[PDB]
Design a protein around this ligand. Structure first.
Ligand code: ZN
Ligand code: ZN
Ligand code: ZN
Ligand code: ZN
Lengths: 680, 1298
RNA sequence: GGACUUAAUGUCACGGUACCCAAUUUUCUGCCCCGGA
């Protein structure tokens, strides 16, 4: 009686304090825990003689608990589903009880409807659409239409109008309600009266307001789902809503989290695919003026480069961030707390320099790659500086992936003896992309820059074979350079010295003729080099070569390291420490297959240490795509020591880079070298 | 067209699942997970019977896999007949996809064929495939097949086709553990079947083309595994448990009727523990009984159940059942009691439960790929086997769940948790090491050896290509079962309250462990082209040889040091699979016969198997030198204990027949040689106490122990010791006694009792005894232990650990129980010479800094200079005429000051004091401290039966004084000084003269009753010395003999160092409260005199026909002896320390009384303070310092100021006042009782004795008239005058009130 | 012999460690004089 009432009042005070958006996520958990402890203590005694208010409070507390649990591994966790199920089961007996009041049933139906809406949102098999529709209709029949004072009934009405149940009688009250936001009003105008002017008017305001909200918010997910639903109905306004949302996201993303960070909500790939498709479709229309078509094709590459500019890591990797002095204390903590606060806020209240794409030196051609998962087609956008024109083309990639998987599986078992699958892979690359050997697409005798995409980063595009009787290789006509993204290019003037530095740390002296040459500098650590010696170069040398092993982390690219005579040096440590490598050419012997993990899917965005070197002022990195023997690396090092302005493609051409018909091992050993970076 | 019959036999426990149709299988998750298991279907409705019917599609899949492997090992040929590559792809159009789709790789070669296979001709590979036939995706005839496989049925050999599921299978839970945190998640469950009784299946294979028989017959013999086990293919009741549940409920109800519900768990554990003693403990009535009383006792075996005792009820239950056996009966009774108690009783509040996640059988559209792999031509393939033994170095534990929740075919909510935790066994009660745990440990070690790896994913559309998985897909292990089948032991654990340093109520939990020294078989197989070096590193890491430990951690509870194994007797062989394939197929790979291979001589090996000689050494492997060896470090040390040690065991005191109150702990050790449990136990200290001491020390040092909760905490204590989110980074082991054979008698018997405050005698039914280990200052005990530290520790945590070690070395944390009276004090610690050098450097440098001893400026005797005026009555009588009374009473109150703001134990307050006091002990009259354990210690009872005789207290032959007596003697004085309550008081007793109103407890004032709760507050005596609900803040130690003249040798008849005492009997209270209206007078104190001289000459005519056996004989020490003891304190305010120092030495002319024979003048002692040290736990860790008297005098002045403030009168001001203690009335009355009138040569020798009886007493002389018929009658001495006289000091009793 | 009980040109389940956190201990001096009918 009085004791139960007093305990219930204390629990409700705690819950109402926890519902305040001014609180922090740390204290909310403890407050909810104390409230649940009080309710369970009361229940363990008055199991059967309990009133409905206690059950309603317990269901509300479990609904609150379900919000504080965040995903960790790209999959919806099971604790969220368990909490929602327990809340529903707790409210079911209060519904089944024979009290006979009105407000009691009204509040119980409100809380059950919101719990079921959330449970259906995160899981569909356990809660079907028909069950939700029946429950919502039954709750509406009880009179849960107080749009002027509560938001949950507004949510119920919006969910009902999404399913197709008519709501003409309450439209005026819903629009008059002050608590409703622009997205809900746009949905009401669209799904009820089949009107588009007011829907556009309010959707523009919603998209403009999205510019200031972090991507952890549920408004982004709701807007992208609404755009997807509009597209699925063969409507018209999605082709502009997608572009506006893309613009808002591109503006918002520039928040400078370690200069490159991302939250990874589940979408943000479907939105970019839809924007790319809409721009391509509105570009394929026939207009007499060609300037609009050129602008649209340029915007396609702009969208591609905006997508490829950053990578995203999961929450469990963000919690285990290794500590540093300056960046770790400020930026990681600020970004993480801001993201968490934005995530938990929507469930309580309802309210250098980037270069231009056309700044390429005379005589160069740039090729952009995009892999559209939505329509299942590939793309390739080329820009010709000498003619100032834009072109694009399409291809299929569902069998090149299978051939690549076969090559990888055979290589990971028989390194040098799997050379008969590399030839097949190169021939498949040549057959799938016939526009690489066309004069209208790529003019012959010109330098080519490659900007690949998800699984094309690991294909030797420079060793293609033309689909004919005795077709030539791609490297016998052009010179090739690689770049993970166009945003990694920078202006650079080579005011460099003439010092050559060597660093080496091996278990055994595989290189003996090397380290005895008299051309090395005065700060070489030729045997037993450590991570502290890499940070001591201050004179901006001309050529730095590091010989060591590799170590890849399969989850966090920041923890990838080079094996030196110490604890090692990692991706983050190079960015934080090394400052004396501005304008210097770097030669690496780390066999990229050891620096990055193998792939088991179409997409990956694992950055190598070459990007870390490029971000601190290096002008170019040279390495091997797979594992070869030390004699080839030694020969490359001597050939580069003799002079430094020579081109790599001639070296690959004169040393058996075209003997795939006769001796496949020579081809395998010779085409493993490529240069990363763009000279300006 | 010939039909063959084949048989399939298992050698391991296989797996089973329920049968569903192809369409209905999609609804379940376990059914989709177990598509490669054996099947089970029901026979009836609501039934418990069925059959097992392993299908032919699984056998066909295994056979074609074997065919593919055999063809690949020979470049696509068999007996000179080439074969093509086959076909493993079907178009989605013009047909339908088959039922199971492939996901792994496929081995391919060069076809080398002239004709394309068709309907008219084919190679044996295409014949074995059902490629060109009349049979397709729909079964029609059963005759169109050129090769057919049927279902395989279990051989029910005996009878009763009604086969129950509970008779064949059992349930178990398996989990997945996160590599980084060390905590598991998303478990799952399965079924396991018995392979010893149900292990043979029979089927048929039909072949209608003789062109593939030669290959089919070899492929049948090349199959190694099926359904999760190794195999071979050859071509030919309610009444019991229900009645015990009813009896358990009756017992529980009977216990509940008397309000004793909390003893049910103890009863259950005690009953379960009886399985190690046999039926003779219940048939011959060997259970322990009461100490003194047989009725109304505190025991549990004598609690009435339905009008009869409990021991008899258990005897009748055993005589009634007598069929299941002793072990099963005890186990089931204990389980029923535990379950009933757990259900009835209904802390660690939990909101959500655990998650059961099954690897989803992933499906998609357009996601199937064909990935061929072609091995090089000319390469060779081998096969390696390893055989050995696994030896347990510590007690191990493999966890299972409650048997009432693992029944196959069977299974608003609140979360309730069990606290029993049994261990894994098989059906014959032998210890088991499952394959899954060993595989998990091997994967965990391989990932560490490689330096990288992947977190296991369960979707699996494309199989992983990382370094660990490639090698893991080539390794096969085997199940292991021992040859030992005796019951295990149970270990208890509790939790302490950081605020009061007492046991938290409701925190008991136990677990079962196996013995140390057991051995298990070991088998490993690897098939490939090259033997890896990481696996060699792991094998060398798991092996012990000549100065190396074994580092294989298996199972759970690694934080407390459970489950460390070692590998021994290793042999490695080799199969050649290119030239000797026929011998490999003929011998079946020696599957199931590895036991005979372990003991086989090298001259009996089968053809094709040779020893392996290129196995690398420990120091030649680059791994294990930079990845595995520096993983864990070791610290080993010895502890010296120079005092009795008692780590109590609570169940052995209930089950053993010794009839003892508190005994020590010991464990069982298995001996490999001679194959038996050793016939003697070993005393040790459990690793949980070892861990808790370090945890508490560090927590008090950093202040993390006073927090509220550690849910998402990242404090220093949570980083070092872990929490419910991450495992620990330090692992502890046991401390074992190593010099126990040097002692003539390892255990000692000691007795204790509580003394009343009013009557001065011992309290009824309050005596207790202990059995500690016999440690002494000149013969200590040696204990040896170790712990392990993980790499990567910071520079501050190492310093914290070394500081904890130093604090333990300095005697700040005693071991065991009863540490406040001198038990288990540490005298030193020695570190081994193999520990890391920096650890010893830190121990030496970070040692507590050396105090600067002052150059004897004020370092002499700390003498309290204060002379009491004494009493004027004996000073004016210099001819010794008066006769005094042996005891008087002290009356004060009734106003007791209580404090509700008590001081906690969880931190070192900066403004409080902590330190150590050293002092001596002179004696002024002969002292008697008996050794009660032996009632015939002088061997005089043979001639005089019934004459008790003792000797002086000693341990190992060294004279000592126990610390309990010192503590009690000081506590009584402190209570009297500060006006506290009566701690020990006889409550319920009545009076009768020659019926009264109330009892003795009813006439005592309510303010003088002992403190009973922390909510009302504590008086100074209970606040300083402690209570049941609050630990005291002072500790006293034993006192050892230093010097002195000799015994009290006197020239008599029987041993010269003894003395026959007089009669000593029965203090009676009805002499100070004569007629039914008087309150108790108060505390009783005795006087100082030399009445012992009269008895030394009255001996001999004391012995002769005066007392037959009423008196006793004992050894007596002379005067002039010196002893020494120590006192410890912590967190004391300044006035408390001042009062402690004042009551420990009240000045000159004042002494204490101690021992037996106080009314006769025995036992006058005087204590002087020798030194005083103090430390303070601050940021810089200030060292030990020696205080001057310039601070001691201030402390005493502050104590005096506190006393005069408690006096309540503002007329007496407070400030800097010279302390004259005789100003306070009650202190003035107290110091007269403790006055020594013969300290200096001012003899003033008084005369004190009790009055004799009426007129005919033995020692009465005519004259004085000092009998009880004169000063005992209300005619010459009124009652009020009598009370006034006996409640007053001197001014004697002889004439009267002179 | 058949059924309960398979489907056939495609089964990595030896693809997953019942794992993680808690001091059997706090308080007590082996002491002792006046009456039984
Ligand atoms: Zn064939
Ligand atoms: Zn892997
Ligand atoms: Zn903590
Ligand atoms: Zn008290």
């Amino acid at each position: 009686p009085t004791r139960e009432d007093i305990d219930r009042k204390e629990a409700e005070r705690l819950l109402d304090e926890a519902f305040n958006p001014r609180t922090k996520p740390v204290d909310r958990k403890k407050i909810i825990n104390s409230a649940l402890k009080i309710l369970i203590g009361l229940y363990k005694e008055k199991k059967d003689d309990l009133t409905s208010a206690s059950f309603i409070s317990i269901a509300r507390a479990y609904y609150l608990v379900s919000i504080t649990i965040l995903p960790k591994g790209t999959t919806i966790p099971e604790k969220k589903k368990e909490a929602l199920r327990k809340g529903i089961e707790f409210i079911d007996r209060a519904i089944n009880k024979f009290n006979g009041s009105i407000l009691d049933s009204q509040r119980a139906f409100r809380i059950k409807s919101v719990l079921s809406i959330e449970f259906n949102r995160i899981d569909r098999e356990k809660c079907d659409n028909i069950k939700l529709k029946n429950l919502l209709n039954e709750a509406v029949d009880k009179g849960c239409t107080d749009f002027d004072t509560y938001e949950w009934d507004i949510q119920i009405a919006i969910r009902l109008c999404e399913l197709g149940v008519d709501m003409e009688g309450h439209f005026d009250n819903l629009i008059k309600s002050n608590k409703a936001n622009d997205l809900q009003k746009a949905k009401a105008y669209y799904f009820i009266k089949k009107d588009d002017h007011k829907a556009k008017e309010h959707m523009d305001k919603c998209t403009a307001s999205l510019k200031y909200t972090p991507c952890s918010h549920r408004l982004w997910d709701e807007t992208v789902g609404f755009i997807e639903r509009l597209k699925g109905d063969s409507s018209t306004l999605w082709r502009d809503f997608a572009i506006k949302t893309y613009r808002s996201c591109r503006v918002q993303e520039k928040e400078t989290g370690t200069l490159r960070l991302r939250w990874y909500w589940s979408r943000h790939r479907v939105l970019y695919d839809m924007a790319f498709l809409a721009v391509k479709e509105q570009a394929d229309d026939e207009e007499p003026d060609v300037n609009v078509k050129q602008a649209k094709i340029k915007k396609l590459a702009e969208i591609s480069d905006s997508l490829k500019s950053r990578f995203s890591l999961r929450l469990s990797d963000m919690e285990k961030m290794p500590k540093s002095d300056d960046e770790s204390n400020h930026e990681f903590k600020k970004f993480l707390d801001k993201c968490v606060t934005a995530y938990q806020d929507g469930y309580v209240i309802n309210r250098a320099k980037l270069l231009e794409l056309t700044q390429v030196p005379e005589g160069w051609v740039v090729v952009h790659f995009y892999l559209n998962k939505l329509e299942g087609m590939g793309n390739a956008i080329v820009f010709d500086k000498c003619a100032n024109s834009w072109q694009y083309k399409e291809f299929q990639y569902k069998e090149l992936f299978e051939v690549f998987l076969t090559w990888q599986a055979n290589y990971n078992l028989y390194k040098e003896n799997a050379a008969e699958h590399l030839v097949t892979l190169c021939k498949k690359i040549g057959e799938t992309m016939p526009f690489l050997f066309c004069d209208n697409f790529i003019p012959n005798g010109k330098d080519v820059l490659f900007v690949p995409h998800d699984f094309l980063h690991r294909l030797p595009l420079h060793g293609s074979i033309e689909n004919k009787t005795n077709g030539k290789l791609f490297l016998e006509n052009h010179s090739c350079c690689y770049l993970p993204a166009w945003s990694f290019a920078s202006e650079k003037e080579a005011s460099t010295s003439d010092e050559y530095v060597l660093l080496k740390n091996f278990d055994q002296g595989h290189f003996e003729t090397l380290q005895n040459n008299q051309i090395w500098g005065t700060q070489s650590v030729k045997d037993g080099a450590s991570s502290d010696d890499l940070e001591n170069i201050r004179n901006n040398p001309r050529l730095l070569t590091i010989l060591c092993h590799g170590e890849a982390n399969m989850s966090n690219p920041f923890r990838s390291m080079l094996k030196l005579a110490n604890g090692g040096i990692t991706y983050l440590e190079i960015l934080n420490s090394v400052k004396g490598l501005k304008g210097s050419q770097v030669i690496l012997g780390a066999c990229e297959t050891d620096l990055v993990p193998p792939l088991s899917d179409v997409m990956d965005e694992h950055y190598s240490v070459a990007t870390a070197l490029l971000l601190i002022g290096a002008a170019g990195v040279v390495g091997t795509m797979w594992k070869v023997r030390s004699n080839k690396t030694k020969s490359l090092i001597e050939w580069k020591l003799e002079n430094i302005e020579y081109k790599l493609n001639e070296w690959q051409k004169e040393t058996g880079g075209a003997a795939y018909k006769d001796h496949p091992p020579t081809f395998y050993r010779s085409i493993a070298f490529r240069s990363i970076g763009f000279p300006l | 067209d010939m039909n063959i019959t084949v048989e399939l036999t298992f050698f391991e426990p296989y797996r089973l699942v329920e049968w569903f149709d192809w369409d209905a299988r999609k609804k379940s998750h376990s059914a989709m997970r177990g598509q490669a298991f054996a099947q089970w279907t029901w026979k009836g409705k609501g039934r418990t019977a069925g059959k097992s019917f392993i299908t032919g599609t699984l056998v066909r899949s295994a056979v074609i896999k074997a065919v593919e492997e055999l063809l690949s090992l020979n470049n696509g040929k068999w007996e000179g007949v080439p074969c093509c590559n086959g076909s493993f792809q079907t178009d989605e159009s013009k047909g339908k996809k088959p039922s199971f789709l492939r996901k792994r790789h496929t081995l391919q070669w060069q076809a080398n064929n002239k004709n394309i296979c068709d309907k008219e001709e084919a190679c044996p590979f295409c014949i074995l495939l059902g490629r060109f036939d009349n049979a397709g995706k729909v079964h029609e005839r059963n005759k169109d097949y050129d090769i057919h496989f049927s279902n395989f049925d279990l051989d029910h050999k005996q009878e009763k086709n009604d086969l129950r599921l509970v008779d064949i299978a059992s349930g178990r839970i398996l989990n997945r553990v996160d590599f980084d945190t060390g905590k598991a998640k998303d478990y799952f469950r399965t079924w396991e079947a018995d392979y010893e009784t149900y292990g043979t299946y029979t089927g048929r294979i039909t072949l209608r083309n003789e062109h593939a028989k030669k290959l089919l017959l070899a492929s049948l013999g090349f199959v190694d595994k099926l359904c999760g086990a190794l195999c071979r293919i050859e071509v030919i009741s309610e009444d019991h448990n229900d009645e015990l549940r009813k009896q358990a409920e009756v017992i529980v109800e009977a216990f509940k009727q008397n309000d004793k519900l909390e003893k049910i768990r103890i009863l259950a554990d005690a009953i379960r523990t009886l399985r190690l003693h046999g039926e003779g403990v219940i048939e011959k009535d060997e259970l322990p009984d009461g100490k003194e009383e047989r009725d109304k006792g505190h025991h549990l075996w004598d609690i009435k159940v339905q009008g009869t005792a409990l021991r008899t009820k258990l005897k009748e239950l055993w005589q009634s059942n007598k069929d299941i056996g002793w072990r099963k009966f005890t186990e089931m009774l204990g389980s029923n009691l535990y379950l009933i108690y757990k259900k009835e009783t209904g802390t660690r509040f939990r909101i959500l439960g655990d998650t059961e996640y099954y690897s989803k059988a992933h499906d998609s559209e357009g996601s199937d790929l064909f990935i061929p792999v072609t091995p090089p031509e000319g390469i060779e393939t081998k096969e390696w086997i390893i055989v050995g033994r696994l030896k347990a170095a510590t007690p191990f534990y493999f966890g299972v769940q409650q048997p009432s929740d693992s029944i196959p075919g069977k299974e608003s909510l609140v979360i309730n948790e069990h606290t029993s935790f049994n261990i894994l066994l098989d059906k014959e009660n032998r210890y088991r090491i499952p394959r899954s745990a060993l595989r998990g440990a091997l994967r965990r070690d391989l990932r560490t050896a490689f330096g990288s790896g992947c977190n296991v994913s369960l979707g699996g559309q494309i199989l992983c290509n990382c370094k660990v998985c490639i090698e893991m897909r080539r390794i096969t292990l085997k199940d292991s079962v021992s040859d030992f089948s005796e019951p295990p032991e149970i270990r208890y654990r509790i939790a302490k309250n950081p605020g009061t340093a007492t046991v938290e109520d409701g925190s008991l939990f136990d677990i079962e462990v196996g013995p140390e020294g057991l051995t298990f078989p070991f088998v490993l197989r690897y098939r490939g082209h090259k033997f890896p070096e990481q696996l060699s590193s792991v094998i060398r890491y798991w092996e012990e040889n000549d100065g190396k430990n074994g580092m294989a951690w298996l199972g759970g509870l690694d934080s407390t040091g459970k489950g460390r194994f070692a590998l021994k007797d290793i042999k490695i062989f080799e199969w050649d699979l290119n030239q000797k394939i026929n011998e490999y197929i003929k011998e079946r790979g020696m599957r199931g016969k590895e036991k005979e291979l372990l003991e086989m001589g090298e001259s009996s090996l089968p053809d094709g198997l040779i020893p392996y000689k290129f196995f690398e050494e420990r120091e030649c492997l680059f791994p294990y030198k930079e990845n595995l060896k520096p993983q864990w470090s070791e610290v080993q040390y010895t502890i010296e204990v120079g005092s009795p040690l008692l780590t109590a065991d609570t169940i052995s005191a209930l089950t053993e027949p010794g009839n003892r109150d508190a005994i020590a702990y010991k464990k069982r050790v298995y001996n490999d040689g001679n194959n038996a449990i050793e016939p003697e136990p070993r005393f040790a200290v459990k690793s949980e106490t070892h861990r808790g001491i370090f945890r508490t020390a560090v927590g008090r040092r950093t202040g993390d122990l006073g927090k509220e909760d550690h849910e998402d905490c990242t404090c220093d204590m949570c980083i070092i010791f872990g929490n419910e989110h991450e495992s620990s980074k330090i692992r502890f082991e046991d401390l074992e006694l190593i010099n126990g054979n040097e002692f003539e008698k390892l255990e000692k018997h000691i007795d204790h009792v509580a003394i009343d405050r009013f009557t001065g005698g011992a309290l009824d039914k309050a005596k207790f005894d202990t059995y500690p280990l016999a440690g002494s200052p000149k013969k200590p005990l040696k204990l040896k232990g170790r712990f392990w530290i993980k790499k990567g520790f910071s520079g501050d945590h190492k310093l914290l650990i070394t500081t904890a070690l130093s604090d333990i070395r300095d005697g700040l944390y005693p071991l065991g129980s009863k540490g406040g009276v001198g038990y288990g004090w540490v005298a030193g610690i020695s570190i081994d010479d193999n520990v890391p050098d920096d650890f010893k450097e830190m121990i030496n440098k970070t040692e507590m800094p050396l105090p600067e001893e002052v150059e004897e400026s004020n370092n002499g005797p700390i003498n309290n200079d204060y002379v009491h005026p004494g009493h004027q009555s004996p000073k004016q009588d210099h001819k010794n005429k008066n006769i005094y009374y042996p005891h008087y009473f002290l009356d004060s109150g009734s106003k007791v000051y209580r404090e509700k703001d008590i001081i906690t134990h969880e931190e070192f307050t900066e403004e409080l004091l902590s330190g150590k006091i050293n002092c001596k002990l002179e004696t002024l009259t002969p002292l008697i401290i008996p050794d009660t354990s032996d009632e015939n210690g002088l061997k005089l009872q043979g001639n005089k039966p019934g004459h008790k005789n003792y000797k002086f207290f000693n341990i190992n032959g060294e004279l000592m004084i126990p610390g309990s007596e010192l503590r009690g003697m000081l506590r009584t004085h402190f209570e009297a000084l500060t006006k506290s309550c009566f701690a020990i008081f006889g409550e319920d007793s009545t009076l009768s003269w020659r019926c009264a109103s109330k009892t003795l407890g009813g006439k005592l004032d309510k303010a003088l009753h002992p403190c009973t709760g922390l909510s009302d507050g504590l008086c100074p005596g209970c606040h300083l010395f402690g209570t049941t609900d609050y630990k005291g803040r002072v500790k006293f130690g034993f006192a050892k003999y230093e010097n002195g003249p000799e015994w009290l040798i006197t020239r008599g008849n029987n041993p010269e160092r003894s003395l026959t005492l007089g009669v000593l009997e029965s203090p009676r209270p009805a002499f100070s409260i004569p007629d039914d209206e008087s309150e108790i007078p108060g505390r009783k104190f005795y006087l100082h005199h030399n009445g012992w001289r009269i008895i030394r000459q009255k001996q001999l005519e004391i012995r002769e026909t005066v007392q037959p056996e009423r008196n006793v004989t004992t050894e007596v020490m002379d005067k002039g002896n010196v002893f020494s003891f120590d006192v410890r304190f912590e967190n004391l305010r300044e006035w408390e320390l001042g009062l402690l120092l004042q009551s420990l030495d009240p000045g000159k002319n004042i002494a204490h009384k101690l021992g037996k024979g106080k009314p006769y003048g025995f036992g006058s002692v005087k204590i002087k303070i020798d030194s005083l040290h103090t430390f303070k736990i601050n940021s810089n860790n200030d060292k030990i310092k020696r205080v001057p008297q310039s601070d001691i005098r201030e402390y005493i002045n502050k104590g005096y100021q506190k006393l005069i403030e408690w006096s309540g009168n503002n007329s007496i001001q407070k400030g800097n006042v010279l302390p004259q203690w005789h100003v306070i009335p009650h202190i003035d009355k107290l110091y007269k009782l403790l006055w020594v009138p013969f300290l200096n040569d001012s003899k003033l020798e008084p005369d004190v004795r009790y009055p004799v009886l009426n007129e005919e007493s033995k020692g009465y002389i005519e004259g004085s008239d000092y009998t009880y018929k004169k000063l005992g009658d209300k005619d010459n001495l009124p009652y009020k005058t009598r009370v006034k006289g006996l409640t007053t000091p001197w001014s004697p009793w002889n004439p009267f009130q002179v």
